[PDB]
Amino acid sequence: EWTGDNTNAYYSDEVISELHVGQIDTSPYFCIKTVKANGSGTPVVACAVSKQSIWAPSFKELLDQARYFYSTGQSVRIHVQKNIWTYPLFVNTFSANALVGLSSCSATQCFGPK
Amino acid sequence: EWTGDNTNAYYSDEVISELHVGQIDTSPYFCIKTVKANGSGTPVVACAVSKQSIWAPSFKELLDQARYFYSTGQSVRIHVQKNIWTYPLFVNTFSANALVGLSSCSATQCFGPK
Amino acid sequence: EWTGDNTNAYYSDEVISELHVGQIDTSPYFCIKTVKANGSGTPVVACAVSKQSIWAPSFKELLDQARYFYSTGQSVRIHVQKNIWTYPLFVNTFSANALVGLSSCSATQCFGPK
Amino acid sequence: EWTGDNTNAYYSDEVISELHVGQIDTSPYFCIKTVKANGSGTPVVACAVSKQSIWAPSFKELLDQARYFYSTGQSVRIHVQKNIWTYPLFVNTFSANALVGLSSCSATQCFGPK
Amino acid sequence: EWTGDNTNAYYSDEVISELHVGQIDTSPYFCIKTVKANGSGTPVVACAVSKQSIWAPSFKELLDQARYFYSTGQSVRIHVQKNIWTYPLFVNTFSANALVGLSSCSATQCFGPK
Numbered sequence: 001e002w003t004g005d006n007t008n009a010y011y012s013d014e015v016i017s018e019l020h021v022g023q024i025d026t027s028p029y030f031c032i033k034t035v036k037a038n039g040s041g042t043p044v045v046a047c048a049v050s051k052q053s054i055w056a057p058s059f060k061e062l063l064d065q066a067r068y069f070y071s072t073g074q075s076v077r078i079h080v081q082k083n084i085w086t087y088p089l090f091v092n093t094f095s096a097n098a099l100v101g102l103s104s105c106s107a108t109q110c111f112g113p114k
Numbered sequence: 115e116w117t118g119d120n121t122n123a124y125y126s127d128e129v130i131s132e133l134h135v136g137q138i139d140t141s142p143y144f145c146i147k148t149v150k151a152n153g154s155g156t157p158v159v160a161c162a163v164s165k166q167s168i169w170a171p172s173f174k175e176l177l178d179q180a181r182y183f184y185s186t187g188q189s190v191r192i193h194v195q196k197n198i199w200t201y202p203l204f205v206n207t208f209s210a211n212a213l214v215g216l217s218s219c220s221a222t223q224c225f226g227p228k
Numbered sequence: 229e230w231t232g233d234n235t236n237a238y239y240s241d242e243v244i245s246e247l248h249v250g251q252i253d254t255s256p257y258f259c260i261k262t263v264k265a266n267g268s269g270t271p272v273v274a275c276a277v278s279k280q281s282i283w284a285p286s287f288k289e290l291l292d293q294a295r296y297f298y299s300t301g302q303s304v305r306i307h308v309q310k311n312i313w314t315y316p317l318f319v320n321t322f323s324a325n326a327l328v329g330l331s332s333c334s335a336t337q338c339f340g341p342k
Numbered sequence: 343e344w345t346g347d348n349t350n351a352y353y354s355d356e357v358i359s360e361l362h363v364g365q366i367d368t369s370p371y372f373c374i375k376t377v378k379a380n381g382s383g384t385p386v387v388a389c390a391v392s393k394q395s396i397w398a399p400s401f402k403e404l405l406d407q408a409r410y411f412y413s414t415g416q417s418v419r420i421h422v423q424k425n426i427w428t429y430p431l432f433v434n435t436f437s438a439n440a441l442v443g444l445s446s447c448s449a450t451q452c453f454g455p456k
Numbered sequence: 457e458w459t460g461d462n463t464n465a466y467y468s469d470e471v472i473s474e475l476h477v478g479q480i481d482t483s484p485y486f487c488i489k490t491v492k493a494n495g496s497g498t499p500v501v502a503c504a505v506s507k508q509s510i511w512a513p514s515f516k517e518l519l520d521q522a523r524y525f526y527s528t529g530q531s532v533r534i535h536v537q538k539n540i541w542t543y544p545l546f547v548n549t550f551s552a553n554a555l556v557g558l559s560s561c562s563a564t565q566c567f568g569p570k
């Protein structure tokens with residue numbers, strides 16, 4: 001597997017606008033909400049769950065990176081894999097998207113699989 | 115279990131006003147006090163204990179996130195489970211509330227379960 | 229044991245004024261000096277030593293918390309257990325106090341045991 | 343092996359201009375892009391992969407250091423070993439350069455091997 | 457062993473002016489350069505190597521504390537043990553000094569062994 005697999009999806013020129021940390025079924029997790037830097041479109045929501053999904057190994061790196069980009073408010077590219085979380089109340093509150101990568105998009109092009 | 119279970123409690127539009135770190139029964143722990151961003155109402159006190167309660171797996175994530183929101187002063191929703199801690203002097207000093215989640219809040223929304 | 233045991237000592241409305249990191253007898257350690265926010269009294273010195281004393285598990289959390297409170301200069305309550313470190317040259321340079329807790333302070337109270 | 347081995351390459355007076363975090367083959371990884379502080383020349387891209395290459399032990403230290411230099415915008419020397427990554431879609435998105443070191447730069451000389 | 461032993465050396469009223477991270481012999485390492493806050497004297501160079509020397513247990517604490525004082529720019533006392541590193545290319549790039557302690561300095565004194 002790779003963040004850049006064509007079976008994953010991404011959204012460019014986004015800003016991380018909200019951050020949540022919690023626990024589910026023994027696993028700490030976090031979710032983020034992103035919106036278009038320019039105010040258009042519909043929010044993207046994605047979550048990472050410790051020790052859950054094939055993306056578990058990157059949980060801490062992604063949590064730290066989401067925090068960094070959340071604090072700067074800079075434009076970024078969000079990489080997700082759809083339809084991963086199945087807990088229905090969790091999905092209704094957040095989404096089924098697993099967060100699988102984060103890329104800066106500084107005044108050029110987003111620096112990630114494209 | 116889940117942060118968002120309706121058997122937990124939450125308080126929206128709060129700011130983390132105080133922070134404490136210590137140790138109990140060989141466990142590092144921390145506590146936070148939150149108040150409404152507008153100053154109304156009664157403070158909420160909640161703690162996390164690294165090796166105790168079903169919420170122990172999220173100790174480090176919650177500590178880091180509480181430290182972050184404390185440093186920014188921004189509005190949050192705090193999620194707790196009531197009636198968890200049992201050492202009477204500890205409960206007298208802080209509360210029986212276990213901290214189980216933290217969500218950032220906009221002016222109109224909080225990004226977490228409700 | 230507990231930070232809040234009445235056999236420990238604490239000092240309210242202190243500012244962390246100095247910070248030192250070193251190694252002793254295979255153990256990284258840190259020491260802080262604190263002085264009353266209003267100028268009265270005598271400095272307090274306390275240290276935490278990795279993998280040494282009953283307070284060992286808290287070493288990392290306390291070091292991180294002391295760094296933060298040191299960086300802000302805010303008024304804190306420092307909790308110690310006296311007469312723990314016995315290395316006489318160490319003691320003479322620093323103190324025999326083990327650091328066992330740190331609490332933020334408001335105008336009227338500090339957020340921790342008393 | 344050593345960051346400073348003469349079989350590695352380095353580029354002085356660079357500014358980290360992009361940062362990317364993801365996962366590949368069960369391993370967290372990050373990539374950075376740097377450009378000459380004066381705008382001449384062409385960008386340098388290098389990546390670290392937490393579980394891969396002889397440089398894996400330094401993954402966390404390099405990621406932490408990269409994030410700090412990225413946040414300051416200061417001029418740095420980036421040290422790489424060429425021709426390490428082999429997955430073609432990864433190489434063509436980023437490069438085959440393994441990141442092996444990062445040095446601050448004085449106004450006249452960078453603090454590291456040359 | 458102790459940071460404060462007779463056989464170690466120290467330099468007061470310094471500022472950490474440069475920082476380098478790398479890897480050698482499978483071990484992450486870092487080096488710092490310090491200069492007198494008042495511009496006088498000769499710079500001090502010292503390194504820490506994760507799996508090497510009797511000071512290896514303090515690697516991460518010294519890294520974090522070096523990074524802290526580097527970002528604040530405040531004046532410090534740097535403690536070293538001389539003639540530790542032996543690989544000639546490394547010593548000639550950096551120094552044979554092992555970093556063994558860091559102490560905050562006020563205008564009149566430093567908070568550490570002397």
Ligand SMILES: CC(=O)N[C@@H]1[C@@H](O)[C@H](O[C@@H]2O[C@H](CO)[C@H](O)[C@H](O[C@]3(C(=O)O)C[C@H](OC(C)=O)[C@@H](NC(C)=O)[C@H]([C@H](O)[C@H](O)CO)O3)[C@H]2O)[C@@H](CO)O[C@H]1O
Binds near residue numbers: 012041
């Ligand atoms: C640039 C211009 O002249 N006019 C833009 C127009 O290009 C906008 O269309 C988007 O532009 C951005 C530029 O970075 C992207 O190219 C975007 O493509 C993606 C994206 O990177 O966000 C590709 C992505 O594809 C994949 C395989 O993941 C799309 N994701 C999915 C699941 O399909 C997303 C997604 O559709 C969008 O992000 C919105 O959700 O787009 C272009 O679509 C256009 C957008 O309003 O406005 C002009 O100003």
Ligand SMILES: CC(=O)N[C@@H]1[C@@H](O)[C@H](O[C@@H]2O[C@H](CO)[C@H](O)[C@H](O[C@]3(C(=O)O)C[C@H](OC(C)=O)[C@@H](NC(C)=O)[C@H]([C@H](O)[C@H](O)CO)O3)[C@H]2O)[C@@H](CO)O[C@H]1O
Binds near residue numbers: 139166198199200
């Ligand atoms: C409520 C129920 O369904 N059954 C109760 C059960 O909860 C009672 O309480 C726990 O019993 C266990 C023994 O199996 C423990 O004694 C526990 O005490 C501690 C603990 O060691 O876990 C003491 C601890 O105090 C200190 C100084 O650390 C408490 N920590 C704090 C911060 O207060 C913890 C903590 O409250 C719990 O671990 C949270 O889950 O509890 C008892 O609370 C049990 C016996 O008293 O009987 C049942 O009927």
Ligand SMILES: CC(=O)N[C@@H]1[C@@H](O)[C@H](O[C@@H]2O[C@H](CO)[C@H](O)[C@H](O[C@]3(C(=O)O)C[C@H](OC(C)=O)[C@@H](NC(C)=O)[C@H]([C@H](O)[C@H](O)CO)O3)[C@H]2O)[C@@H](CO)O[C@H]1O
Binds near residue numbers: 366391428429430
């Ligand atoms: C070299 C050989 O003996 N036979 C070749 C062989 O090149 C092809 O197999 C690939 O090439 C070698 C075989 O060991 C590489 O090790 C590579 O393995 C990885 C690895 O898992 O370590 C693949 C990995 O790709 C992914 C998606 O993770 C590479 N990672 C990246 C970011 O590119 C790493 C990495 O390059 C090295 O670990 C660097 O040290 O190598 C094998 O997949 C084989 C066709 O499969 O053809 C033979 O001729």
Ligand SMILES: CC(=O)N[C@@H]1[C@@H](O)[C@H](O[C@@H]2O[C@H](CO)[C@H](O)[C@H](O[C@]3(C(=O)O)C[C@H](OC(C)=O)[C@@H](NC(C)=O)[C@H]([C@H](O)[C@H](O)CO)O3)[C@H]2O)[C@@H](CO)O[C@H]1O
Binds near residue numbers: 466
């Ligand atoms: C203006 C005036 O009235 N007096 C100063 C006078 O204080 C100077 O003496 C130096 O002052 C600084 C104050 O922090 C230090 O005390 C310095 O001593 C050390 C030091 O702490 O840096 C002690 C150290 O000793 C040991 C055993 O490590 C010395 N290190 C070594 C390996 O020998 C270092 C080192 O020699 C210096 O830091 C410079 O590299 O000095 C006092 O020497 C006095 C001379 O500077 O001039 C007046 O201005």
Ligand SMILES: CC(=O)N[C@@H]1[C@@H](O)[C@H](O[C@@H]2O[C@H](CO)[C@H](O)[C@H](O[C@]3(C(=O)O)C[C@H](OC(C)=O)[C@@H](NC(C)=O)[C@H]([C@H](O)[C@H](O)CO)O3)[C@H]2O)[C@@H](CO)O[C@H]1O
Binds near residue numbers: 344480
């Ligand atoms: C009695 C006699 O003949 N020699 C001893 C001897 O024990 C000491 O010399 C060390 O002994 C072995 C021989 O290699 C060590 O391996 C050491 O080499 C390294 C090491 O691997 O630990 C090499 C290393 O170089 C690299 C590229 O990693 C050195 N690291 C650096 C950054 O220079 C380290 C390092 O210098 C030491 O580990 C620090 O403790 O050493 C030989 O140096 C000799 C002291 O050097 O004392 C004699 O009694």
